Amino acid sequence: MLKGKVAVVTGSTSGIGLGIATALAAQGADIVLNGFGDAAEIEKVRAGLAAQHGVKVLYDGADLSKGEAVRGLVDNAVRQMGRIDILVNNAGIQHTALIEDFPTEKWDAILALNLSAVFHGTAAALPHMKKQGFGRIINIASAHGLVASANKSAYVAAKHGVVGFTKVTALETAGQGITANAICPGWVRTPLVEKQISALAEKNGVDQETAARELLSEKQPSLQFVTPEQLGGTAVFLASDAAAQITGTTVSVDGGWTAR
Amino acid sequence: MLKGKVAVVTGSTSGIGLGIATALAAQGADIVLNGFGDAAEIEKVRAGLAAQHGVKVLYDGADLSKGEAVRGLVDNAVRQMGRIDILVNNAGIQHTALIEDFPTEKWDAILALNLSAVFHGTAAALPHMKKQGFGRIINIASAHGLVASANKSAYVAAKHGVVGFTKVTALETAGQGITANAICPGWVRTPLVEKQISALAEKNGVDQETAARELLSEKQPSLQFVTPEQLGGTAVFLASDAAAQITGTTVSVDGGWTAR
Amino acid sequence: MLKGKVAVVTGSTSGIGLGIATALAAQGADIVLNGFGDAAEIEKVRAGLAAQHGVKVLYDGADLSKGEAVRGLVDNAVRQMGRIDILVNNAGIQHTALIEDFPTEKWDAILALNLSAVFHGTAAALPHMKKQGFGRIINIASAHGLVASANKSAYVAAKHGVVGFTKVTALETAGQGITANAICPGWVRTPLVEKQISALAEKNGVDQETAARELLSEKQPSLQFVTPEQLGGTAVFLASDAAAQITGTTVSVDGGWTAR
Amino acid sequence: MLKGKVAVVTGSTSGIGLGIATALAAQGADIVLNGFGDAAEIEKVRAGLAAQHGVKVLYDGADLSKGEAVRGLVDNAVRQMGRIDILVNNAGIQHTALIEDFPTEKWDAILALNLSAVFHGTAAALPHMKKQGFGRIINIASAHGLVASANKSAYVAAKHGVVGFTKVTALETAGQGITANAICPGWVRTPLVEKQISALAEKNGVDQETAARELLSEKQPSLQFVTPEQLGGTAVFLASDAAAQITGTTVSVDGGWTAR
Ligand SMILES: NC(=O)c1ccc[n+]([C@@H]2O[C@H](COP(=O)([O-])OP(=O)(O)OC[C@H]3O[C@@H](n4cnc5c(N)ncnc54)[C@H](O)[C@@H]3O)[C@@H](O)[C@H]2O)c1
Ligand SMILES: NC(=O)c1ccc[n+]([C@@H]2O[C@H](COP(=O)([O-])OP(=O)(O)OC[C@H]3O[C@@H](n4cnc5c(N)ncnc54)[C@H](O)[C@@H]3O)[C@@H](O)[C@H]2O)c1
Numbered sequence A, B, C, D: 001m002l003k004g005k006v007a008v009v010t011g012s013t014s015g016i017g018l019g020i021a022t023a024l025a026a027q028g029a030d031i032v033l034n035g036f037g038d039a040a041e042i043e044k045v046r047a048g049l050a051a052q053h054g055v056k057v058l059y060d061g062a063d064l065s066k067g068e069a070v071r072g073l074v075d076n077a078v079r080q081m082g083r084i085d086i087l088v089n090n091a092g093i094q095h096t097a098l099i100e101d102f103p104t105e106k107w108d109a110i111l112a113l114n115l116s117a118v119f120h121g122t123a124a125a126l127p128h129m130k131k132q133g134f135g136r137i138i139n140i141a142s143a144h145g146l147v148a149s150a151n152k153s154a155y156v157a158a159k160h161g162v163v164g165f166t167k168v169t170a171l172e173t174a175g176q177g178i179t180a181n182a183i184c185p186g187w188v189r190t191p192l193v194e195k196q197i198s199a200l201a202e203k204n205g206v207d208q209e210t211a212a213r214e215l216l217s218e219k220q221p222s223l224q225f226v227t228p229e230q231l232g233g234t235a236v237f238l239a240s241d242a243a244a245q246i247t248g249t250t251v252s253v254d255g256g257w258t259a260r
């Protein structure tokens, strides 16, 4: 379990990040939620997790496109929660276009959130974790941090960068009670993916579910979506003492995507 | 938990395999132990696990250098235990030499046990797992399934081969309720490693613990050995429902060995 | 240019090996051919090659499924041709079946040729190359030495093993004027592949070309076959002085196969 | 040979880029040089290459930290040279510090040049290359695009990003006459590396060559630096027709660095 520990999960107001925050709360960790969406729904999520699991849950609406706001999220988590044991760098965005059609604003935004926010959050966390002699940094990269798809240049570059950055984090902290690893999921049916399902159904003139199956079949041999609950379990495992010597690596949760 | 499941762990009379078997037993799985050793000592291990964890524990001493014995171990497991849910292919040997000095006899032995036993065990298990709609194949590869060292050609080749074979097992079973993955440890201070520590101590004319630290420092950034307990916890995670979409991949438990 | 250097190409009587042997001949290297087939055609090829490029081209029908025959091929290349500069380990075979249906004989034969022949070939070549202070070992692995496909367990395992073995070869020879690398081709339209195209045509009820394009389309983004000519040019590059510090690595010639 | 072709080589006033430009000029390619340093020396280099190899050589001093300047470099190369056949994305910078000490300005500067300039350059080049039905994009990544070192977070992230980006480039252009690949060098003794040798020398209290040897032995099994001339040869090879199906891959020129 994780009783007495504090976890900050970026982009945990929905999707994968909410599944990870929920799993960590279920292990007894105090939680800092973060991310956008509807404020009433966010408060319900926050109060609900605290009540259900009997842990402290805070919400910090920092916009993680700004480096100082990311560092502020971590530093304020320590101020309010008293420590930071687990940092899950999860917030991310997507945009698809051919490289020559890829707007520079979109390239910049994807690098800022999907890559640079991992840097800033890690930089802010590490002095605390070093003083603690304990930390777990868990970066949510992607199958796209190990391999590529067409039309996803900024996202694939960013996710590859996160994988490299995770390795450096591990090497700088090796032996200090701190590990850093990157979870690399295949498809998870969140709004990030639903948008691309919708696009494919339009392009192909089929219904939504036919597009969903095709999207899966192209990439994911199992023909099964990964779930936020599975990814929460994986984060819980990396946070555990069994994973004390798992550091600087990727854990692919992808139904066979990268095996072929 | 793994109540009502049966796990076979090859080479589980000592070292890593025993740590894995013990961890799975503690989650409530029935266990088939395998490997060599003293009758009284093995029986104490077997009877002690059964009594401690309240599970059935069989010992089958089959020599896994012969394909027919490996398949017979899986057969005997199903015969005596009723089913097979988890196969951990762990038994392995080492031999160090320059490639041009490498005894063909040792090349052959290392491939037969370190690689071919995985094929034979997997082949025997899969029809059961496929009929059940459930299975977990957990191969114990190495950091040497992903990178190399000098003087370990048969071992690196076999372990690389295990990684490839794992991927194919996964693709053949995708979506069928079965996963196959390879745990890739760094240094674990078993007799397999102690022999190399001893060899270094004599070569460099220092004491055992200086040789121990140098063996670690050369490969493993954390400067800490991985433990059988940690690898057992890693196996338990791979066996769990959270890992239902982790397939065809490697899990490096190596203290940063492969990150640099 | 490779004037006054000697290259052994295993399995060079046909397909990829022939392409490599040719390209190296055209660079002024002495050749030892090897492989199976009508001895009249083999003299025609061997003579044609010797005449056209002004090089000594020998032939040796050694069956490389046997360790001592492989070690013989090399030593007899040295006795006859004076030296060995380039060893290309290329001979290999394929067999498709589910793991549980894979005959042990086929498993064993695929390992013996596709993997163990590389060990035996290398073990023999090394003493000469080392005393010479120059050598190039070029292993013909595959995309399947890096990723996997369903139904190719022995092939994928041996080919991963070659990649691993190549790395160890590099490390043991580092700085000694010798490099070892593995070329990893995607689909090359040889009989080894024609066989599989034919099977797919029958399975789907389509002509040979619809089957070929679909085979390509599945794996190879460029939708173009790799050629023995190209693989030959790749071998030539690896043999050049520019590649002096290219060691222990793979060169993927695969039209994008491993990129996604 | 590359007669009639135009190559743009970023940061080719010094080091690896100059080696690559030189190699390409020698094959008959017209060259656009770029980068900083002494203007009189740059002119000697530019006029020298032009006269030595009988090709047109232009200097464009665009500061590639600005995306518009990178696109301007490519667009003006097409304007002044008639076409663009080969784009070598080479310019890069280094800064070493622990993650928590790493200045944001240096993080941003490294991503902008070492990663974003690769996007901007590629984006400008692609419409031209697609029109022409021929293109070669050669990205100078690093061993640090595939593995990590402590204290190099921005550089390792950027270089991993370049490896990912190269893959997406390959997939988007697959079959169209264009390839995109990433050359991944180990140590090359440029001023980028000399600065590190100097810091090591002062850290350890040794002379420069003791520090050079130690920097070498830490990472590079061959104990030999890679040369700009070798990298030029590799670039030339990738520009060749033999590499027409080499796309979306890395070519490691690293003396065994990533093998272990
Ligand atoms: N869905 C998938 O198939 C998939 C697969 C692999 C990896 N990933 C990665 O998982 C992570 C989460 O993705 P998801 O699919 O759950 O997406 P999602 O859109 O459902 O969730 C994104 C979360 O990030 C938050 N967010 C977005 N911009 C933010 C900002 N500027 N500051 C703070 N928060 C911000 C959102 O409010 C939300 O909480 C991403 O990094 C994504 O790249 C997703
Ligand atoms: N110790 C390490 O640092 C390390 C690191 C990475 C991977 N590994 C791998 O982990 C596995 C276990 O290694 P370990 O260090 O615990 O070794 P170990 O020598 O301590 O134990 C090996 C086990 O396998 C059994 N065994 C040996 N030959 C057998 C045979 N022919 N048939 C049946 N059983 C046999 C032994 O009886 C013993 O139970 C091996 O596959 C090894 O390659 C070990």
Ligand SMILES: NC(=O)c1ccc[n+]([C@@H]2O[C@H](COP(=O)([O-])OP(=O)(O)OC[C@H]3O[C@@H](n4cnc5c(N)ncnc54)[C@H](O)[C@@H]3O)[C@@H](O)[C@H]2O)c1
Pocket (backbone or CB within 6 Å): C010, C011, C012, C013, C014, C015, C016, C017, C034, C035, C036, C037, C062, C063, C064, C065, C090, C091, C092, C093, C113, C140, C141, C142, C143, C184, C185, C186, C187, C188, C189, C190, C191, C192, C193
């Ligand atoms: N064809 C492809 O798409 C492809 C792709 C990637 C890698 N490869 C690899 O390239 C290599 C050659 O393949 P290919 O397509 O040219 O096959 P091929 O069937 O066209 O040629 C096989 C060659 O090896 C020889 N050979 C077979 N068994 C031998 C033995 N026991 N001893 C000596 N020689 C023997 C044959 O005589 C022939 O010359 C193999 O290692 C294969 O795994 C092929």
Ligand SMILES: NC(=O)c1ccc[n+]([C@@H]2O[C@H](COP(=O)([O-])OP(=O)(O)OC[C@H]3O[C@@H](n4cnc5c(N)ncnc54)[C@H](O)[C@@H]3O)[C@@H](O)[C@H]2O)c1
Pocket (backbone or CB within 6 Å): D010, D011, D012, D013, D014, D015, D016, D017, D034, D035, D036, D037, D062, D063, D064, D065, D090, D091, D092, D093, D113, D114, D140, D141, D142, D143, D184, D185, D186, D187, D188, D189, D190, D191, D192, D193
């Ligand atoms: N030296 C090595 O060991 C090594 C190893 C692997 C990869 N690399 C990579 O090789 C590339 C070149 O490295 P090098 O060692 O030759 O370095 P170098 O410093 O000797 O050369 C760098 C070149 O880039 C130019 N440059 C710097 N900033 C620029 C800017 N804003 N706009 C345009 N040009 C600019 C410089 O003027 C110079 O021409 C880099 O991408 C580097 O990361 C270097």
Ligand SMILES: [Mg+2]
Pocket (backbone or CB within 6 Å): A147, A257, A258, A259, A260, C147, C257, C258, C259, C260
């Ligand atoms: Mg793939």
Ligand SMILES: [Mg+2]
Pocket (backbone or CB within 6 Å): B147, B257, B258, B259, B260, D147, D257, D258, D259, D260
């Ligand atoms: Mg390494």
